[PDB]
Design a binder for this molecule. Sequence first.
Ligand SMILES: Nc1ncnc2c1ncn2[C@@H]1O[C@H](COP(=O)(O)OP(=O)(O)OC[C@H]2O[C@H](O)[C@H](O)[C@@H]2O)[C@@H](O)[C@H]1O
Length: 203
Amino acid sequence: GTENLYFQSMGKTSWEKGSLVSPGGLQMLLVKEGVQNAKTDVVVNSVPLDLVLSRGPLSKSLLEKAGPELQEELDTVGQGVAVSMGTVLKTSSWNLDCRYVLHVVAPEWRNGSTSSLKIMEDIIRECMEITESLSLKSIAFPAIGTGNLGFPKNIFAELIISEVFKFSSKNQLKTLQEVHFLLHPSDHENIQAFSDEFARRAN
Ligand SMILES: Nc1ncnc2c1ncn2[C@@H]1O[C@H](COP(=O)(O)OP(=O)(O)OC[C@H]2O[C@H](O)[C@H](O)[C@@H]2O)[C@@H](O)[C@H]1O
């Protein structure tokens, strides 16, 4: 579709549809759209420890589109469990076009803490594992961590893309076929970072 970005080839004289396929067959797509318009089976949201969905711009976009039930169901899920760093909570999608939202408590950059890298990578891995376990086909990651949590966008781009490759190399997948990277149309920094990394991988 028209929301599928291209990336410029490293030689600069060509442009390629924003699509990369791992050797194992897992497809990654560069998509320019609001997370609120995602149509994958799963969409990933980053949330604080207290699970309030109206504090960050990403989550707030999801809340407004989905309706107040998203906050209500999230709070329901969180009641029985001790919510901590890295926890993933699943809800239904309400007025969103996806089937499930995976709400993740993502870490602060903390000046490039190695702890934060590891935690973010493991969140990303886990969300894909969950998606496969639910027998679902596709998952959309927006650029979680790159706003209030302060992950540099170039570093986040290579982090998530490398994790998707790694996950694909280590797993035989029965249903998970697509990972979409959802970039907000005005987030020119993320669009560049993700495009640059696709160019590198393709070369
Ligand atoms: N509607 C959208 N669609 C797609 N991407 C978006 C959208 N809106 C913003 N972005 C991009 O979404 C990315 C992330 O922006 P943030 O919402 O700050 O999430 P964080 O993971 O950094 O952490 C902040 C939250 O977590 C902490 O617990 C705080 O309490 C907050 O609740 C940015 O690159 C935006 O450009």
